[PDB]
Amino acid sequence: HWGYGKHNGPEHWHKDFPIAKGERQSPVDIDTHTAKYDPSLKPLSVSYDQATSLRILNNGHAFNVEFDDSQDKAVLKGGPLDGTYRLIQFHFHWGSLDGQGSEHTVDKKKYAAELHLVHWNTKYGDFGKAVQQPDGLAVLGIFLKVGSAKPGLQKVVDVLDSIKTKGKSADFTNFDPRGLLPESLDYWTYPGSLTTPPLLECVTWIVLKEPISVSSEQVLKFRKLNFNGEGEPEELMVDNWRPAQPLKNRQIKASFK
Numbered sequence: 254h255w256g257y258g259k260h261n262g263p264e265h266w267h268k269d270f271p272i273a274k275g276e277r278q279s280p281v282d283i284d285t286h287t288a289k290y291d292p293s294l295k296p297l298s299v300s301y302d303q304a305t306s307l308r309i310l311n312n313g314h315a316f317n318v319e320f321d322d323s324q325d326k327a328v329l330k331g332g333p334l335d336g337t338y339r340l341i342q343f344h345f346h347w348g349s350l351d352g353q354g355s356e357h358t359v360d361k362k363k364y365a366a367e368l369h370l371v372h373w374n375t376k377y378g379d380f381g382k383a384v385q386q387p388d389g390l391a392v393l394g395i396f397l398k399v400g401s402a403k404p405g406l407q408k409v410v411d412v413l414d415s416i417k418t419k420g421k422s423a424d425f426t427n428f429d430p431r432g433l434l435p436e437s438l439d440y441w442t443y444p445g446s447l448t449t450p451p452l453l454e455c456v457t458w459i460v461l462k463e464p465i466s467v468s469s470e471q472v473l474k475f476r477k478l479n480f481n482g483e484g485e486p487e488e489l490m491v492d493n494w495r496p497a498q499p500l501k502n503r504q505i506k507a508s509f510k
């Protein structure tokens with residue numbers, strides 16, 4: 254029964270998930286002046302041309318756009334990564350107000366939302382085995398600011414009416430995640446965790462410096478989703494972000510400057 258309310262939100266999660274107070278939790282604040290440029294990271298490779306989206310699901314915390322991950326079709330490699338990581342799903346975290354919503358922060362700045370493209374290390378065979386390993390996942394995080402519309406997001410926005418409440422899904426084929434990427438792939442990277450329960454410490458985070466722009470109308474549609482199931486009292490799906498966690502014994506590396 255974890256969630257984002259007062260009685261079940263992030264400050265409570267540790268009771269069911271003690272790793273919430275662990276040594277490599279996410280998100281974190283990215284102190285841009287303290288991140289160090291690492292000239293050895295290798296180039297980062299996002300290869301989404303054969304991506305096969307299948308479905309979109311309201312899971313009661315966010316919505317997931319799910320991909321066919323039964324072959325190497327949409328993969329992330331390079332950068333800090335050893336080997337190849339397959340795209341399984343993406344989702345967002347967002348606020349009730351444009352002044353909050355991101356999980357990572359940049360010099361304490363909160364963005365309106367944050368996109369997570371979730372990938373698992375193919376050496377572990379599937380996602381459920383991967384999440385039990387310290388290098389099991391690579392999550393590409395992309396900040397959203399409110400300004401111009403993102404054309405490549407609109408297909409997602411337009412289907413949300415059909416998945417308003419928890420447990421609803423809809424077919425969502427032929428969606429191209431390349432339409433969600435900024436121009437630059439400059440990034441910060443650090444070892445962390447899932448940002449929702451079970452909070453497993455299995456993620457190499459790759460957080461892009463350049464945000465994408467989405468329109469006020471687009472984010473407003475996100476905020477019409479519901480945490481609740483159909484036929485239950487309406488609770489808008491907003492503020493589904495975990496705040497920054499202590500950095501502890503970690504260094505954030507930059508791919509640039």
Ligand SMILES: O=C(/C=C/c1ccc2c(c1)O[C@@H](c1ccc(O)c(O)c1)[C@@H](C(=O)O)O2)O[C@H](Cc1ccc(O)c(O)c1)C(=O)O
Binds near residue numbers: 371447
């Ligand atoms: O570890 C797991 C499963 C953990 C898990 C389950 C559901 C999840 C999950 C992890 O990640 C969460 C998640 C995903 C993305 C995020 O950004 C995030 O913050 C949180 C969550 C969600 O989608 O919100 O779903 O299963 C294996 C078994 C097991 C099960 C299945 C298999 O195929 C296998 O080989 C082994 C085991 O229990 O050892």
Ligand SMILES: [Zn+2]
Binds near residue numbers: 344346448
């Ligand atoms: Zn996430």
